Amino acid sequence: MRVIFSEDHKLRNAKTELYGGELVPPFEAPFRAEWILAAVKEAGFDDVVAPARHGLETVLKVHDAGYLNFLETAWDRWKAAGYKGEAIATSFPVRRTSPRIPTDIEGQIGYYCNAAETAISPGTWEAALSSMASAIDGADLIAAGHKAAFSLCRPPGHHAGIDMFGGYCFINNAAVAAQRLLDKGAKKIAILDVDFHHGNGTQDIFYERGDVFFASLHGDPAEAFPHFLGYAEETGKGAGAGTTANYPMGRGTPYSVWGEALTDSLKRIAAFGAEAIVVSLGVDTFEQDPISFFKLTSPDYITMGRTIAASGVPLLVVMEGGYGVPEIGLNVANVLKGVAG
Amino acid sequence: MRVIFSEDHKLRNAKTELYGGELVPPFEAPFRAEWILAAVKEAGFDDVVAPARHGLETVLKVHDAGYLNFLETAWDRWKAAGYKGEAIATSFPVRRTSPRIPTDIEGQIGYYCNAAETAISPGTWEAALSSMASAIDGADLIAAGHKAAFSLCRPPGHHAGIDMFGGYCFINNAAVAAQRLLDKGAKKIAILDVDFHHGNGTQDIFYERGDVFFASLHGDPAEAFPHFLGYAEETGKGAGAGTTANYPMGRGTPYSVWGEALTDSLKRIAAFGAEAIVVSLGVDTFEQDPISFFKLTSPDYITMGRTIAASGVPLLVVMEGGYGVPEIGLNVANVLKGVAG
Ligand SMILES: NCCCNCCCCCS
Ligand SMILES: NCCCNCCCCCS
Ligand SMILES: [K+]
Ligand SMILES: [K+]
Ligand code: NA
Ligand code: NA
Ligand SMILES: [Zn+2]
Ligand SMILES: [Zn+2]
Numbered sequence: 001m002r003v004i005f006s007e008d009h010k011l012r013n014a015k016t017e018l019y020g021g022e023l024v025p026p027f028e029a030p031f032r033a034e035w036i037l038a039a040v041k042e043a044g045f046d047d048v049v050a051p052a053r054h055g056l057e058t059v060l061k062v063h064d065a066g067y068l069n070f071l072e073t074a075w076d077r078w079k080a081a082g083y084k085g086e087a088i089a090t091s092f093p094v095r096r097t098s099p100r101i102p103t104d105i106e107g108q109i110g111y112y113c114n115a116a117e118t119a120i121s122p123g124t125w126e127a128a129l130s131s132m133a134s135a136i137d138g139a140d141l142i143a144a145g146h147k148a149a150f151s152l153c154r155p156p157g158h159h160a161g162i163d164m165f166g167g168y169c170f171i172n173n174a175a176v177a178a179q180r181l182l183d184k185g186a187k188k189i190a191i192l193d194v195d196f197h198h199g200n201g202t203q204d205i206f207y208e209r210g211d212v213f214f215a216s217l218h219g220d221p222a223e224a225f226p227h228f229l230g231y232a233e234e235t236g237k238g239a240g241a242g243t244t245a246n247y248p249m250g251r252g253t254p255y256s257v258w259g260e261a262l263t264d265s266l267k268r269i270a271a272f273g274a275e276a277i278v279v280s281l282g283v284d285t286f287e288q289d290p291i292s293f294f295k296l297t298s299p300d301y302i303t304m305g306r307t308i309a310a311s312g313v314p315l316l317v318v319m320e321g322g323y324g325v326p327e328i329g330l331n332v333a334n335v336l337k338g339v340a341g
Numbered sequence: 342m343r344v345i346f347s348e349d350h351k352l353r354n355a356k357t358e359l360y361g362g363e364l365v366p367p368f369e370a371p372f373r374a375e376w377i378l379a380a381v382k383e384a385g386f387d388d389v390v391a392p393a394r395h396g397l398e399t400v401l402k403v404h405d406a407g408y409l410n411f412l413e414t415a416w417d418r419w420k421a422a423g424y425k426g427e428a429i430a431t432s433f434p435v436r437r438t439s440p441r442i443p444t445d446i447e448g449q450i451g452y453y454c455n456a457a458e459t460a461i462s463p464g465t466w467e468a469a470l471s472s473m474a475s476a477i478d479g480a481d482l483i484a485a486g487h488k489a490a491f492s493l494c495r496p497p498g499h500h501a502g503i504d505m506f507g508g509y510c511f512i513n514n515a516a517v518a519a520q521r522l523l524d525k526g527a528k529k530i531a532i533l534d535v536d537f538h539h540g541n542g543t544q545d546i547f548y549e550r551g552d553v554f555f556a557s558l559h560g561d562p563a564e565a566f567p568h569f570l571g572y573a574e575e576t577g578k579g580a581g582a583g584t585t586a587n588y589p590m591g592r593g594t595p596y597s598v599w600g601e602a603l604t605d606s607l608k609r610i611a612a613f614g615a616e617a618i619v620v621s622l623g624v625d626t627f628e629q630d631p632i633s634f635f636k637l638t639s640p641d642y643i644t645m646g647r648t649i650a651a652s653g654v655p656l657l658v659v660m661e662g663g664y665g666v667p668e669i670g671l672n673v674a675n676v677l678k679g680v681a682g
Pocket of ligand 3: 193194195196197198199216217218
């Protein structure tokens with residue numbers, strides 16, 4: 001299978017992340033992509049290609065235009081306002097606030113943010129567009145008849161909602177890929193989010209859409225980031241009724257339990273009639289992940305890839321999270337081995 | 342007039358504030374109270390007394406119980422979770438989130454926060470209770486027949502809403518004072534917020550209540566903190582209809598303009614029939630204030646106090662903001678001179 005990857009991911013190289021009341025080097029750092037690329041090549045997936053660039057045609061169908069405009073100039077405005085650090089939101093539009101959009105940079109960065117750990121830094125927008133491009137080109141391979149492809153996206157996407165960034169995410173790459181598949185002729189597409197964290201951004205984008213089914217397996221939001229979405233009761237609204245399936249799970253969950261939710265999610269996706277599945281792949285479900293509480297082992301990723309591919313429908317694998325250790329690469333590569341085997 | 346002041350304000354001595362993407366020493370630091378106290382004594386207001394302690398009777402009528410329980414244990418829980426810095430929220434319940442309350446400390450601190458610049462530190466709860474006590478004792482003086490009193494509150498209160506802390510505020514002292522006056526027999530009370538920033542917390546607490554009228558003069562929230570409340574169109578709802586009056590004003594506003602809004606607010610308060618006015622006094626309207634854009638001069642504070650007192654109705658002055666410069670003390674003292682003159 002082809003691997004789509006842009007060297008322009010490195011334009012996002014933020015210096016700070018707000019974690020535990022401290023500003024620390026970010027977990028979502030350029031070396032993650034280096035580790036993953038090296039491991040997938042070592043596993044034999046060496047057909048690596050840069051994406052063609054893309055404009056905003058596809059992404060405007062899943063993200064708000066004001067949001068994208070804000071990201072395009074956020075860093076410049078932050079710097080012009082005289083702030084000394086990176087661009088980090090402080091005030092947020094929480095319960096019982098006005099729905100109005102501020103005009104200034106401090107107000108706007110909060111208006112457009114869901115989580116303050118994520119700083120905007122110079123090059124962030126450009127990196128996000130490159131990552132989106134990798135997702136688009138991956139989708140195009142699936143549309144053209146390939147049964148699998150891997151978009152090595154960085155920065156990741158699944159916490160970015162219609163008009164919010166956060167969780168290290170700015171453009172929802174998986175959502176853009178799903179939209180691209182619909183634009184190329186699909187009528188029904190599923191997104192299956194296996195990252196440890198709920199894909200709250202993806203859920204937001206498709207919650208009221210009946211053309212996309214969203215399934216997520218994740219740490220229970222009662223006690224895990226992103227904290228404010230991902231409960232099982234959330235099944236969709238309006239045109240999207242019945243097209244969100246959340247599988248929250250608790251501390252220590254191993255594959256023997258996690259795989260049961262996987263089986264069920266795939267049943268749901270099959271009943272929906274998805275023509276392809278965009279897999280939002282994070283490997284922060286690993287038993288050594290520094291910020292997560294699941295207990296998957298490296299061999300479990302092979303099982304996971306094989307099971308998702310036994311759907312018999314084409315897969316686009318889109319990179320999301322997985323942190324801390326170079327074994328994130330082995331784990332990603334193992335999912336691909338399961339898909340290709 | 343009597344000045345109520347607790348030395349226990351000093352138990353709030355946080356190390357950090359998130360400002361401009363950096364963790365810096367807080368603007369709202371113990372020296373503020375020292376400076377203000379010294380200046381009011383210098384102006385002849387030397388009848389200074391400590392508040393009696395108070396439990397939660399009064400405050401439970403303006404703040405949510407879950408919120409107060411959260412504040413009481415937040416520091417302990419944050420430390421027990423192993424975080425190394427002070428307690429700073431990251432995820433927030435923004436647009437289109439679940440209304441559910443998280444169980445863990447990271448989820449809860451965001452659930453109960455409106456602004457991430459404000460860290461919870463050891464002693465914060467105890468300090469907030471002492472500041473609340475100063476407000477309650479001030480209210481009791483008014484209830485007993487005094488026409489003026491000054492509660493030198495620290496930490497301040499007006500950004501704390503029903504179930505949210507932020508803007509350096511944890512317990513809404515002015516809201517507690519208003520409630521105490523109602524509990525002592527008043528039927529109608531007004532809160533007049535002259536701090537540069539909108540009292541979004543106070544507005545939240547009384548938005549649907551007809552027994553309290555809230556007026557605020559402030560920097561336009563389209564460009565100024567708190568960013569997400571304080572527009573003129575917000576006039577109240579339900580039983581509270583017509584009991585919020587917001588006067589947003591722009592960059593460079595001097596007393597000649599600000600005083601016209603003051604006059605109008607007092608007309609509204611008189612028409613409401615307030616039996617007393619709780620003045621949320623911030624002096625960050627000063628032309629030198631480091632974080633604000635109004636252009637009041639030190640003499641204007643005397644005019645302001647005199648005009649508010651010309652209402653002919655008893656006043657409780659409750660300390661809010663005012664930062665940076667040594668003149669914060671002179672400016673507060675000048676309001677008291679205007680009231681007492
Ligand atoms: N203490 C837990 C901090 C979690 N903060 C954000 C993690 C985002 C990963 C996205 S895949
Ligand atoms: N760049 C403006 C930072 C504003 N941050 C909060 C100020 C709170 C004052 C309360 S009286
Ligand atoms: K997930
Ligand atoms: K105000
Ligand atoms: Na949907
Ligand atoms: Na009211
Ligand atoms: Zn993740
Ligand atoms: Zn203020």
